[PDB]
């Protein structure tokens, strides 16, 4: 738990992503693949993208980024009561996309780096701490769902 105050700062920076989900989505995926290249491999629509310029042109990359931030936004609005939204995600990432929990941590950092790059005036010391805590809470519930699905906790 975040205090109500903290959920509020979280929802407030999230409003900036909602004004351009696909643009922030694409940037988060390019930041992720540039910082942890190995994450690239879980994505078969893109194991063939060779440069930032190919990533920037990829229509599928933009759509997947979009899909990913749309689902994150939906969890976030639940404000910690996202049990129901989380389950299907843990089911699919655990057994099908097979994503290790550390990759959830790399994506969290990429999300923060994009927020920080694109909205510095709105992403102060406050909004920063609230957003990390919200992403952290998300990581921990996922890991717990993994553990309970009998996976690599
Ligand atoms: C913010 C954390 C994440 C959220 C909210 C999220 C959400 C989603 C959603 C909603 C889908 C579509 C339905 C499904 O398969 O479940 C999806 C697909 C997928 N995600 Fe995740 N995801 C997250 C993190 C990641 C990470 C870190 C990776 C890999 C490093 C990943 C890899 C994939 C793959 C491979 C697919 C299938 C994509 C495709 O259509 O080609 N996701 N994700």
Curated annotation (Swiss-Prot):
Keyword rRNA-binding in annotation: no
Residue positions, PTM Phosphothreonine: 67
One Gene Ontology term from the biological process aspect of the record: oxygen transport
EC number(s) stated in the UniProt entry for this protein: 1.7.-.-, 1.11.1.-
Subcellular location: Cytoplasm, Sarcoplasm
Stretches that traverse the bilayer: none
Record-annotated Globin domain positions: 1-147
An example Gene Ontology molecular-function term: metal ion binding
Statement: the UniProt record of this protein carries the keyword Oxidoreductase: yes
Top-level taxon in the UniProt lineage: Eukaryota
Annotated binding of heme b, by residue: 93
Catalytic reactions on record: Fe(III)-heme b-[protein] + nitric oxide + H2O = Fe(II)-heme b-[protein] + nitrite + 2 H(+); H2O2 + AH2 = A + 2 H2O
Main location: cytoplasm
Function according to Swiss-Prot or TrEMBL: Monomeric heme protein which primary function is to store oxygen and facilitate its diffusion within muscle tissues. Reversibly binds oxygen through a pentacoordinated heme iron and enables its timely and efficient release as needed during periods of heightened demand. Depending on the oxidative conditions of tissues and cells, and in addition to its ability to bind oxygen, it also has a nitrite reductase activity whereby it regulates the production of bioactive nitric oxide.
Quaternary assembly: Monomeric.
Protein name listed in UniProt: Myoglobin
Species whose genome carries this gene: Sus scrofa
Encoding gene per record: MB
